[PDB]
Structure formats: structure tokens, C-alpha cells
Design a protein around this ligand. Structure first.
Ligand SMILES: Nc1ncnc2c1ncn2[C@@H]1O[C@H](COP(=O)(O)OP(=O)(O)O)[C@@H](O)[C@H]1O
Ligand SMILES: Nc1ncnc2c1ncn2[C@@H]1O[C@H](COP(=O)(O)OP(=O)(O)O)[C@@H](O)[C@H]1O
Ligand SMILES: Nc1ncnc2c1ncn2[C@@H]1O[C@H](COP(=O)(O)OP(=O)(O)O)[C@@H](O)[C@H]1O
Ligand SMILES: Nc1ncnc2c1ncn2[C@@H]1O[C@H](COP(=O)(O)OP(=O)(O)O)[C@@H](O)[C@H]1O
Ligand SMILES: Nc1ncnc2c1ncn2[C@@H]1O[C@H](COP(=O)(O)OP(=O)(O)O)[C@@H](O)[C@H]1O
Ligand SMILES: Nc1ncnc2c1ncn2[C@@H]1O[C@H](COP(=O)(O)OP(=O)(O)O)[C@@H](O)[C@H]1O
Ligand SMILES: Nc1ncnc2c1ncn2[C@@H]1O[C@H](COP(=O)(O)OP(=O)(O)O)[C@@H](O)[C@H]1O
Ligand SMILES: Nc1ncnc2c1ncn2[C@@H]1O[C@H](COP(=O)(O)OP(=O)(O)O)[C@@H](O)[C@H]1O
Ligand SMILES: O=P(O)(O)OC[C@H]1O[C@](O)(COP(=O)(O)O)[C@@H](O)[C@@H]1O
Ligand SMILES: O=P(O)(O)OC[C@H]1O[C@](O)(COP(=O)(O)O)[C@@H](O)[C@@H]1O
Ligand SMILES: O=P(O)(O)OC[C@H]1O[C@](O)(COP(=O)(O)O)[C@@H](O)[C@@H]1O
Ligand SMILES: O=P(O)(O)OC[C@H]1O[C@](O)(COP(=O)(O)O)[C@@H](O)[C@@H]1O
Ligand SMILES: [Mg+2]
Ligand SMILES: [Mg+2]
Ligand SMILES: [Mg+2]
Ligand SMILES: [Mg+2]
Ligand SMILES: [Mg+2]
Ligand SMILES: [Mg+2]
Ligand SMILES: [Mg+2]
Ligand SMILES: [Mg+2]
Lengths: 320, 320, 320, 320
């Protein structure tokens, strides 16, 4: 079967979500399917706030950050009774399946829907690059460029004043963004959650650099590891060089998607449709060793471990 | 007289400084003069740290941020005895005049040295836009782009989530940055130090916005006015909408100068030399109503005044 | 009187046209006026293709290139009989006046409408910076940045191979864009329509540069002056250095507007409304010596001469 | 053995080359080796033009385009006698191995030198993406952004005017650039050299587009396939819609490397040295399915093959 499908964006927004939706809509249409766009992820589902999507409703969207459909958190969705009101709207709208774009929270919702007879496909949308079974997630590369662009500006100013700059990068519990940024910006030190942090190894590395004539030091550090103001104070004390802490924040979440994002989103969206049409349900799409793959949601969540990019850390240390 | 001139960068670095230097060196060379570059602003002047500059030393500098001579904050320059040393260094090297590129603070140093008999020329180099006698200062336009770009990015994320975003802008005690940025980013409310700040008006304006169906709200505020974190929480409580505070910081000070900065800097550089060959000293260059102008330093510091830009603000409120 | 007004964009598009329209709409609304948006400039007028514009129809437009209303050429409009069908649509729609955003072609149309009892205000929209009675036009600064961004990339590649690069810049019969670009990119030679071109002065300047150790030469040249392929061949022959010609083209017309554009458009749009309300008609808005001014359209067109930016050319030559 | 290595950049410059060099120099230093930088690719090798490189010579290079050692197209390197001279220069300087960074052509030189007994290592440096045994080459991603950005800009102008835009992309005999660009810019039609070009299909697709109400149409075509000017006129006649051809040119080759290039380059650089210390020679590094890999040069040049990317193209047509 499957005549009509639903699409939503749930969880934290990431550049390339619009490309993904377009990817879905255009794929669907071409295959003679009808498409409903659901507002504010799962909440919109619950409240029955939807719209009919044609090919033009996804035009002028490919090079746009955010999610035109909106995103929202709806913890309640974990309650089967809430999902019962959800399913009724589905029947009542004649939706046969959905494509969900989000993180792991979103994939769980989607698993719940599948066992209730509404096959769902999950696509990775997040700048954190922390979803299992994918080398990359949509929004990663866009954030990477925002961060590096920031580090470039900081180098200019840091040089001018022979300063040390600490930069707090997003990623929550994943150091991928930090680490990649650090290589690309030629940072002097990197602090990621996956490695034990030694304030001491840091100090030594900075002084060694200073002894070598380095005019500036740039420290890349993942958020939630310490208070960057405290850390800046500590460095200034112990090194005699004025330190300045910078917290990029939410700028990392916005802006026009980079080509990698535009293209990954596009390809993923199209593969979503092909999956539904071949009868799959409760799968999460991913990109592994440059190949598009699909896994059972439960399998990916409970059975896969997020590998540590050790080879990139080794490389980082050699180019200091 | 006047066969050899000196040139330094003082105070907070600003994009376009390299362009100003290049302006100076190239003009001077063409007029048969010799140029000495003083390192680390007033610190290298005191420590007698200088190098000779040829036409090639300013090559590949026009599109770079920072200052290759370095800059410093040497508060001790306030002492008339330290300035005594600096002047001796100047005479020993055979230097006839000095070209100082910096902010309001650097203008004071230049003034003090003029008062001592050493002829200087001040060029407005600061992202802040706070020097008297000039519509703009080198680096303003560049920082304006860094900021506006940041804002374009926050509009995307706060829209996807129906959030309120508080952006803290540099400027110190000047609102130009914050104000030009709020109009260019189409901000909901602007808070500057030249106008009385009313938590009331802010909440009321925002609420109004929500009534009319605005998906996001961007509030642009000058630094040192409050705790954006405290202010953020306060907004969240009073409106029921999630709020996020972003502190741009030091990214505003770096990066490749925008066209305007590159050009202004070059023009002021060439003009400095013209003034020198004419026999003027103790003067500062500015751009006034599209005209390259010079004033007695003393006149600018003391008896000039900052124009209340009700003009930009009345327009700002109209477009909300 | 005046209860309702019309707005259109005519002639070649330029970044910041959307900011201008927003500027008008929001200003109008705030003043209790109603607003019609006319499609494809004057053609749309003729054919009666309009829409009602509210405050939301101009949202998410400020940072967007192009004109959402469209532009189109309609030479026929010069015929009074065509204008008669135009006026009937106006009456029939109850439009009392219009704000026209374009070039001088557009201003003439607008003059015609005024004498026929429908007061029109003209705003400068064009990357050429060639409208009389304005220091700048909307779109100029955005193009300037696109060109300089291009020149920066060309320097990198030119250096690597010790090449000469000729870059053809837009501007039609005005060298403002070329000249500004040349200073900002540190070009070795500039060719603008306003100055007699000597292939010889060019060759000499290039060899002198080459004799001096210059690793690259960048030549900035305004379009319609020669065939850049022919000119590249000529340079290669006479200098022994491989030459490459680059024609930027239409990339110059697009992209997100720079802050200067966002703000000039905004201010101009708002001033348009104030003019209509004070009873003026048949005026063209401009920015002169940092002041917003208005002139009689005929006066501006037939009586003002486009000044030559001689002071910028003098400066260009000194920094070679 | 192996105490001193050499490093050069050959062929068409590519953004990330500076990053590759830095990769090499920094790794080598760390392993106790000595590094010689050869100027102007195979030309300086022949003329024996070299410099010693320390850790500081590669500082401030990571974010810059081009190559600071220079590059050259020295066709004469084809002569076995010229290569005889080059090898003598190498032995006289005490150099044990060579690291060559260039394209398909440079790989031939490296191969010929290996054949003569001098051990080399090839690193894929070219915007084209045409080397066998690597998914990507240094500079590809950067040129992809230069292009996509160009396209975002043309969408704005061609939309305001209901125009068709023909964009000519670099690549030589490889379609990757053109193809990735067409999907990322949401192009209407793509013309590449790996597929048969049908003027018919093109007009028919475009006409289709107009039927469905498309305001613009962007056609992305690889260079050396036709005369975009001729093709432009042909389209204009057959569709009644104004067409414009834009030739991106050399802007594609320059500018600051994107994050991906910066990182890949660093990683390949470090890897070269590892291979050297292991005793391998006559090898070339590539990135295959996210893995750093090495192959016998000979194997890559001769018996490897280019993968028909029907995959990207089938998806391209789906999203139109
Ligand atoms: N029915 C329509 N009415 C108006 N504009 C349209 C229509 N369909 C497409 N367009 C416009 O034409 C351009 C190209 O359309 P399309 O190829 O579908 O967009 P995209 O490349 O962004 O996917 C865009 O500016 C789009 O907004
Ligand atoms: N176990 C679950 N069962 C059902 N729905 C869930 C479950 N976990 C999360 N969700 C739904 O997914 C939404 C997003 O979850 P969250 O953890 O916030 O995001 P992410 O997908 O980014 O990890 C939640 O608000 C809720 O609607
Ligand atoms: N009153 C003063 N007398 C003499 N020198 C001064 C005076 N004020 C500032 N300076 C010098 O100018 C430097 C830069 O000033 P500052 O206010 O910190 O920044 P900026 O010039 O960037 O605005 C000071 O560090 C000091 O060397
Ligand atoms: N003596 C020299 N040796 C090497 N490179 C030089 C020399 N003089 C100039 N160059 C290089 O040649 C290019 C052109 O120089 P120039 O026009 O003077 O630089 P800019 O445009 O930055 O003012 C630049 O990349 C510069 O670094
Ligand atoms: N009635 C509405 N419905 C949906 N979104 C709206 C509405 N009004 C405004 N918005 C959105 O809220 C944001 C801010 O609105 P507004 O201040 O009017 O835009 P802008 O700053 O671009 O002028 C934009 O993303 C806009 O699209
Ligand atoms: N003398 C005129 N009288 C009436 N309408 C005119 C006149 N000149 C131009 N127009 C109108 O203005 C439009 C734009 O003119 P054009 O010269 O193409 O542009 P621009 O305003 O950019 O100079 C024309 O298509 C026509 O509709
Ligand atoms: N068959 C060959 N034998 C020896 N050297 C070669 C051969 N082909 C190319 N080269 C050398 O490699 C250089 C660069 O090659 P080219 O094809 O022009 O560019 P790229 O390496 O950038 O792809 C040539 O100029 C020449 O010095
Ligand atoms: N000996 C030195 N003298 C002057 N500046 C130096 C020296 N060594 C490094 N630097 C400068 O200090 C900063 C940090 O150096 P480094 O980390 O080695 O550069 P990069 O990050 O580009 O690898 C750079 O701006 C660089 O040019
Ligand atoms: O948007 P919030 O709620 O302020 O949360 C910030 C967090 O969300 C992220 O920006 C991205 O998270 P997602 O996994 O939901 O996409 C993290 O990097 C960051 O820690
Ligand atoms: O760079 P510091 O020493 O942390 O000081 C930051 C201050 O300098 C500035 O960045 C620039 O101001 P000045 O040019 O006057 O120094 C201010 O906006 C900011 O308040
Ligand atoms: O868009 P077209 O018709 O190809 O014309 C190109 C011309 O239009 C411009 O791009 C701008 O012209 P406008 O005065 O109409 O805005 C010129 O720079 C260029 O010569
Ligand atoms: O730079 P040139 O000598 O004009 O040649 C241009 C050619 O070089 C490239 O820019 C890059 O190709 P290579 O790296 O193989 O030299 C091609 O895309 C283009 O065809
Ligand atoms: Mg979660
Ligand atoms: Mg470093
Ligand atoms: Mg100051
Ligand atoms: Mg707004
Ligand atoms: Mg005209
Ligand atoms: Mg130059
Ligand atoms: Mg090649
Ligand atoms: Mg399209």
C-alpha cells in the first residue's frame, strides 16, 4: 500500500533539515505519493496541525537553515495514551507512514509508531554528530564551518595582543565538532569529553609553545567540561599571558547549509522514500564508509557504540 | 625637514589596521621618506623595538585582520617619565614624526606626546566607533558584518523553536554597533547605553510581537548593561517562551576587513603623509559627511561631541 | 488625502530591494495606510497584477537578494496610451500614490504618473552607483563585496603561478564599482570609462611591477571597454607572463545584502512614506554627504552631472 | 636511512595545498627528519631552487589558499634528461625522498622519478577530483563551495527576472564538480562529459519547468562542452525566456580552504611521513570509503578506474 505519507522535524534544529524535507517531498511526488507536512514535530502530530505539501512548498528552501515545519519538545509522547490521540489523527488524515528527522529521542517515538502499524523512517538531523550508525549527521559540516570561521577571527585578534583564547564548542557529550575544529584551526590544545583532562598537560603545552615563540595559543574545548571563565583565570595565573574565553553558543545552530549538508540531506531524503516503498518500517538511515545504509532503530540505539575518533586526535598532536 | 617617520598600532586591534599601515608606508615611500615600524604600540616605543619597512613589508596585508606590528595596552604610558624615555628613543633613531593608529585611549597618548614637542598624527582604529570628529572608525563596518551575520544565524534557530534570543554586542560605552546591527538584523528590541533601559517596555514589546504571531524575537543589547543570563531567565518567566542569551565576544574583533574598512584605511593612510609634508602635527584624521578631515587632537578629545542618533532609533521602532 | 499606496520594483535587480519594500510596507502600516504590492514593475501595473501587503508579507525578506515582487522591462510604458490603461487600474484599485524602486528609466515613468495626479516617490535600486543626486544607490555595497571576494580568490591562484589576471567588472558606463574594487583588492592597474585608456601605460606599469619582484598583477577593468580575451593575449605577448581573463558576470547582481544595504534601504523606504504624507510628489530620494535628501526627478535627471571619483583614483596610484 | 626529505607543489594550485605542506613539515620535524621545500614544482627542482623549512615556515598557512612554494606547469619534465638533472640536484642536497602534491599530471612525473630510482610519495592536490584511487582530492570541497555560493547568487537575480542562467564550471574532463554543484544548488538541468549531451532534452526539461510555474531555471554545465554563449542564445530563441551565461573561471581555484580540505590535507601530510619511515616509495595516498589508503602510483595511473556515479545523477533528476 502507501498512498500518502507524513514528514516532521523533532528535537534540536540543524542546517540541512529543509534540504531533507525537500528531498522527501520531491521523491514522494515523483512516485505518485501525496505528502503531509506536520508542524512542531510530535506536538503538531498530537494536536493535528498539518498542511498539504506540493512541489512548490519545498522550493527556495534548499539553501535555508532551520526547519520551516518547526520543531518542539513533547516528552508526553512517551505515554501510550498520548500516542493514542496521535494515531487517531493519522487515521483521520489518511496518513500511511512517516519520515522522521531528528536525533535518538525522535527515533524512539518512530519505533513506537511502527509497532502500532504506521511504518516510520528516521533521518539524522543534528550538529552534534552523535547518532549511532552514521559517520555523519545532517548539520555537522555546517556547524564545523561556523566554528572554524570563528577560530579564524580569533587568531587575528589573539595574534595582535599575544593572547591565549579558550573557545567553548557545542557537542554536548561528543567531541567530534571540537576535535575537527581544532585540526582545521591549528589549535594548540584540545579538550574533549572522551579523554581525561589534565589542566597540567594543558599548562605545559602552552608554555612549551610560548618558549617556542608562539604569538598566540588557541584552546578548543567541548561544553560542559568546566567553566571557561574559571579556566581562563587559571591559565592567566600560571602563564602570565592574558586569556580570553569565548562561548560560540547558538550561532553554531544556524545559517545556510554547506554543500555537504545540502547533498547528504537530499540523498537521504530520497532513500527514505525508496525504503517505505520496499516495505521497510522502523529503520534509521545513515551514511557509513561513504555508503547509504539502514538499520533497525532498536538495533542502532541499544547495540551500537559511538566510536572515538582516536586517529584524528593523534594527528592533532603531531601538527601542534 | 621630515625625512623619516614612525608608525604604530595601539589599543584594541581592529580589522583594517594592516590596511592603514600599508596606506602610510606606500605613500611615504613614494614621497621619498623612510619608514620605521614600531612594535607593540606604546610598549615597543618605550622598549625601543622597531624595524625598517620597505614596499614589500606591507604586501599581502590588505585583506588580513589584526596588526602585524602588534598592539598593546600599556597603561604606564600615563607616566610622563615613561614618555620621556619613548621620545628619547624616537630622537636617537632620527625619527621626525609619528603616525598612531588606535582608539580614544591611543589619542590621549598621541596628544601627550604632542604636548611634549613630538609631532604625531592620529588615525581612528577601533571597532567601537567612539572617537570624536569622525563618522566612522576603521573596523566598525567589519565588526558590523560579523555581528549581522551572527544574527542571520540566530534567526534561523530561534524560528524553528519559537524562541527569544538575546545577543550581547561589543562597543563598551557606545551603541553604534548595537544599533546598526539591530536595524540590519530586523531585531525586535534594541537596548543601548545612550537611552534609559526599561525591563517593562522590553517585555511589553515582545508580548506585542507574540500577539501579532511572531515566531521568534531577537533582542540586541550593548555589553555591560546587565547579565544577559539573568535577563534571559527574566524574559522566559514573564513570557512563557524559551530564551537564549548569546555573547558574541572577541569574534567581533577579528577577520578579513570588509571593502569599506580596506578603503577608508588606505585613504586615511595616504592623507596622514600629506598632512605631514604640509607641516601639521598634533592632528587626527576623520571622515565627516563623506569628507576626509583633520582636527587638532586636543579639540576632538575635549570640546567635540557625540551626536544623539535619534534618527536611526526612530526608524528602528517603525520597522519592528 | 492618501489612504492606500502602491510599491514596485522596475529595472535591473539589486541586493537590498527587499529591505526597501519592507521599509515602505512597515512605515505605511504604522501610519495607518494600506499597501498594494505590484508585480513585475510597470508591466504588472499595466496588466493589473497586484496583491495586498500586510506586515508579515515583508518578514524574512531583509536578508534576501532580489525583489519578491519581480521586475520586468516595459518600454511601451513610454506611450501615453499605455499609461492610460495603467491609470485605470490605479483608480479601480483605489491606489492614491506609489513608491518606485529602480534607476533613471523608472524615475521617468514615475514623473509621468505624477503629472497625471498620482504622486510618486523614487528610490535608487542598482549596483552601478550611477543615479544622479545620490552618493550611493542600494545594491552598490553588496556588489562591491562580491567583487572583492572574487579578487581575493584570484590573488591566491595568481600568486601560485606568477600570473597576471584581468577582471571584468560590471558598471556599464560608471567606474565606481571597478575603482573601489581596485583599491580594496590592491590591484596593479585600473581601467574605467571616465579616463582615457593607454594599453601602453598598462604595459609599463606591469613590467615595472615585475621588475620589482611582484609575484602577481591584478588588473581591474570596467565592462564594455575591450574584449578581455584580446587584452589578455596582448599582455602575454608584451610581457612574457601568462595572463587569464575573468568575467564576474551576474554573480555581482545576487546574494544576501550587506549591512550598509540593509540599513540604507530601510531608512530610504521610511523616508518615502514621510514624503508622501507631507504632500510631495515626483521626487527621487538620495543620500548626499551622509544626509537623506529629495529632489525633483526632472531636476536630478536633466540638470545634475555624475561627478568623477578623482580623489579615489589618485589614492589608487599611490598604493601600487 | 632517510634523514632528509623534500616537498613540492605541482600542477594547478588548489586550496589546501598550504595545509598539506604544513602536514608534512610538522610530522617530519617531530620524527627527527629535516625538510627542504622546492620552489615552483618541477621547474625549481630542475633549476635547483630550494629552502630549508622549520616549524615556523608553515605557521599562518593553514587558512590560506594557493601554495607558498609556488607551482608550475613544466611540460619539459617529460624529457628523461631534464629528470636526470633534477635527480642530480636531489642527491647533491642529500635528499632521500620526495613528497609531491599535485594532480594527475604531477602523478606521472612522480612515477617517472620512481622508475629512475628516486622514491616519491604523491598527495592528491587538485580542484578537479580526477585522480584514481581517492574518493576526493584536496581542493574539491573548497571549489564546490565557491561554485554553490555563486549559484545561490544567480538564483536571486534570475528569479527577479524570470531568466534562465547557464553556469560554466571547471573540472576539465571530470563532472564531479558540476554534478555535486547541481544538486546543492537545486539546478534544473545538469550537463556533464560522462553522459551524452542532448540539446533536445534540455529545452524539453526547461519548458516542462515553465509549465509547472518555475520563475527561474539554472543550468550547470562542465567546461569544454560547448559555447555557453551560443547555447544561451539557442535557449532564449527556443523558450522565449531571456538567458544569461556565466563563466565562473579562476575564482574556483582560489580562497581560504574549507574545513574538510584543511583536515584532509593535514591527515594526508602526516600519513606521507609514516609511509616514508616504513620504507615505501612510489606510492600515492587517497581517501577511500573514509579510510586513508596508499597504492602503487603505477597501479592508480594505469589499471584503476573511475566510478560512474549514476547514483548521484538518478537522485538529481528526482529532485528537479
Ligand atoms: N508555482 C510557482 N509559482 C511561483 N514561483 C515558483 C513556482 N514554482 C517554482 N517557483 C520558483 O521558481 C524557482 C525554482 O523552482 P524550484 O526548482 O522548484 O525550486 P528549488 O530549486 O529551490 O527546489 C524558485 O525561486 C521557486 O520559488
Ligand atoms: N522513548 C520515547 N518514546 C516516545 N517518544 C519519545 C521517546 N523519547 C523521545 N521521544 C519523543 O521524541 C522527542 C524528541 O526527544 P529528544 O530526546 O528531546 O530529542 P532527540 O531526537 O534530538 O534525541 C520528545 O519530545 C518526544 O516527543
Ligand atoms: N590619559 C592617557 N595618557 C597617556 N596615554 C594614555 C592615556 N590613556 C590611554 N593611553 C595610552 O593608550 C593606550 C590604549 O588605550 P585604550 O583606552 O586602552 O584603547 P584604545 O586606544 O584602543 O581605545 C593605553 O594603554 C596607554 O598606553
Ligand atoms: N620582492 C618580492 N618578493 C616576493 N614576493 C613579492 C615581492 N614584492 C611583492 N611580492 C608579492 O607579489 C604580490 C604583489 O605585490 P604587491 O602588489 O606589492 O602586494 P599587495 O597587493 O598586497 O600590495 C603579493 O602577493 C606580494 O607578496
Ligand atoms: N503571522 C505570522 N505567522 C508566522 N510566522 C510569522 C508571522 N509573523 C511573523 N512571523 C515570523 O516571525 C519572525 C519575525 O517576524 P518579523 O519581525 O515580522 O520579521 P522580520 O524581522 O524579518 O521583519 C520571522 O521568521 C517571520 O517569518
Ligand atoms: N521616458 C519614460 N517614460 C515612461 N516610462 C519610462 C521612460 N523611460 C523608462 N520608462 C519605464 O521604466 C522602465 C525601466 O527603464 P530602464 O531604462 O529599463 O531602467 P532603469 O530605471 O534601471 O534606468 C521601462 O521599461 C519603462 O517601463
Ligand atoms: N607524462 C609525463 N611525464 C613526466 N612528467 C609529466 C607528465 N605529465 C605531466 N608531467 C609533469 O607534471 C606537471 C603537471 O601536470 P598537469 O597535467 O599540467 O597538472 P596537474 O598535476 O595539476 O594535474 C607537468 O607540467 C609536468 O611537469
Ligand atoms: N618564532 C616565531 N616568531 C613569531 N611568530 C611566531 C613564531 N612561531 C610561531 N609564531 C606565530 O604564532 C602563532 C602560533 O604559531 P603556530 O601554532 O605554530 O601556527 P599555526 O597555527 O599556523 O600552525 C602564529 O600566528 C605564528 O605565525
Ligand atoms: O537548544 P538548547 O535546548 O539550548 O540545547 C543546546 C544543545 O542542543 C545542541 O545544540 C544540539 O542538540 P540536538 O541533539 O538536539 O540536535 C547541543 O549541541 C547543545 O548542547
Ligand atoms: O580586548 P579586551 O582587553 O578584552 O577589551 C575588550 C574591549 O575592547 C573592545 O573590543 C574594543 O575597544 P577599544 O578599541 O577601545 O579597545 C571593546 O568593544 C571591548 O569592551
Ligand atoms: O541584466 P542585463 O540585462 O543582462 O544587463 C546587465 C547590466 O545591468 C547591470 O547589471 C545593472 O543595471 P541596472 O542599472 O538596471 O540596475 C549593469 O551593471 C550591467 O551592464
Ligand atoms: O590554470 P590553467 O592553466 O588556465 O588551466 C585551467 C585548468 O586547470 C584546472 O583549473 C585545474 O586542473 P588541474 O589541477 O589538473 O590543473 C581545470 O579545472 C582547468 O581546466
Ligand atoms: Mg535525546
Ligand atoms: Mg597553532
Ligand atoms: Mg577605546
Ligand atoms: Mg524582526
Ligand atoms: Mg535606463
Ligand atoms: Mg598589489
Ligand atoms: Mg590535472
Ligand atoms: Mg530548482
Amino acid at each position: 500500500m502507501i498512498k500518502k505519507i507524513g514528514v516532521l522535524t523533532s528535537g534540536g534544529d540543524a542546517p540541512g533539515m529543509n534540504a531533507a524535507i525537500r528531498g522527501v517531498v520531491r521523491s514522494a511526488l515523483t512516485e505518485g505519493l501525496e505528502v503531509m507536512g506536520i508542524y512542531d514535530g510530535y506536538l503538531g502530530l498530537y494536536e493535528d496541525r498539518m498542511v498539504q505539501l506540493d512541489r512548490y512548498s519545498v522550493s527556495d528552501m534548499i539553501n535555508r537553515g532551520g526547519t520551516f515545519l518547526g520543531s518542539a519538545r513533547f516528552p508526553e509522547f512517551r505515554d501510550e495514551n498520548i500516542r493514542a490521540v496521535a494515531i487517531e489523527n493519522l487515521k483521520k488524515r489518511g496518513i500511511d507512514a512517516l519520515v522522521v528527522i531528528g536525533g535518538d529521542g525522535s527515533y524512539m517515538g518512530a519505533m513506537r509508531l511502527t509497532e502500532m502499524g504506521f511504518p516510520c523512517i528516521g533521518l539524522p538531523g543534528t550538529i552534534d554528530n552523535d547518532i549511532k550508525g552514521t559517520d555523519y549527521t545532517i548539520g555537522f559540516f555546517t556547524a564545523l564551518s561556523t566554528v572554524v570561521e570563528a577560530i579564524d577571527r580569533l587568531r587575528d585578534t589573539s595574534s595582535s595582543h599575544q593572547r591565549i583564547s579558550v573557545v567553548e564548542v557545542m557537542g554536548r557529550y561528543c567531541g567530534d565538532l571540537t576535535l575537527a575544529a581544532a585540526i582545521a584551526g591549528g589549535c594548540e590544545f584540545v579538550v574533549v569529553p572522551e579523554v581525561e583532562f589534565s589542566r597540567e598537560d594543558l599548562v605545559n603545552e602552552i608554555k612549551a609553545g610560548i618558549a617556542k615563540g608562539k604569538k598566540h595559543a588557541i584552546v578548543a574545548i567541548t561544553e560542559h567540561m568546566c567553566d571557561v571563565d574559571e579556566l581562563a583565570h587559571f591559565i592567566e595565573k600560571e602563564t602570565g599571558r592574558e586569556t580570553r574565553a569565548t562561548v560560540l553558543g547558538h550561532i553554531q545552530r544556524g545559517g545556510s547549509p554547506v554543500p555537504y549538508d545540502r547533498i547528504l540531506a537530499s540523498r537521504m531524503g530520497a532513500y527514505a522514500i525508496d525504503l517505505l516503498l520496499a516495505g521497510y518500517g522502523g529503520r534509521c538511515v545513515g551514511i557509513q564508509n561513504e555508503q547509504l545504509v539502514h538499520h533497525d532503530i532498536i538495533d542502532a540505539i541499544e547495540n551500537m557504540k559511538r566510536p572515538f575518533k582516536g586517529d584524528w586526535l593523534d594527528c592533532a598532536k603531531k601538527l601542534y
